[PDB]
Design a protein around this ligand. Structure first.
Ligand SMILES: Cc1cc(Oc2ccc(CC(=O)N3CCOCC3)cc2)ccc1C#N
Length: 188
């Protein structure tokens, strides 16, 4: 078969019922995640290969970066609650990995302020119980699949993408194979 278990994807031993159809996990501390966002634009290219309107979900994880890692999961919950993911993803990545100017929760907050989210708006969300359950949702989703590594993508709670089984001599061909694999898995 052109696509087979163990090559472009692996199959979860215990599938996860009611999981988001396309679910990505990442960390602002994760170097491949940085490339997946800035150099490869994986989420964008996957979306362009799936039917219009289908739900793609993207969640942050705690297991990289200790205290700041958890702050960033809460900040990502803020970003999702306010709908400003597209505004803060790049400056958070660069603040953590490129300039290394993000060292505290205050520094994370500055990224949002510079992105134009008002201070009162950020702080009210940060302390909201709506963001607490959004944090809980990100944790539960990752715990359901015993996630020990990012970047990760799961399809229908059943299939996990295997980018190590794809060729990386050409960055565009890799993004293609990844997006085409998500499509094939989604139709499975
Ligand atoms: C062209 C290209 C291909 C890539 O393929 C990848 C190879 C491996 C991973 C997974 C991984 O690292 N994990 C997960 C489990 O264990 C912890 C760490 C992701 C992407 C990565 C980057 C680029 C670029 N530029």
């Amino acid at each position: 078969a052109q696509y087979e278990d163990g090559k472009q994807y692996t199959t979860l031993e215990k599938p996860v019922a009611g999981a988001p159809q396309v679910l990505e996990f990442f960390s602002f501390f994760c170097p491949h995640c940085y490339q997946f966002e800035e150099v490869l634009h994986i989420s964008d290219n996957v979306k362009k290969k799936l039917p219009e309107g289908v739900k793609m979900t993207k969640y942050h994880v705690n297991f990289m970066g200790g205290d700041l890692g958890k702050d960033l999961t809460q900040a990502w919950a803020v970003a999702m609650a306010l709908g400003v993911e597209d505004k803060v993803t790049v400056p958070l990545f660069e603040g953590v990995q490129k300039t290394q100017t993000i060292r505290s929760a205050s520094d994370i907050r500055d990224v949002f302020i510079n992105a134009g989210i008002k201070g009162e708006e950020y702080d009210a969300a940060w302390n909201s119980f709506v963001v607490k359950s959004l944090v809980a949702q990100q944790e539960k989703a990752a715990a359901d699949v015993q996630l020990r590594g990012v970047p990760a993508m799961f399809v229908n709670g059943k299939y996990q993408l295997n980018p190590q089984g794809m060729d990386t001599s050409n960055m565009d061909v890799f993004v293609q194979q990844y997006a085409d694999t998500v499509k094939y898995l989604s139709e499975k």
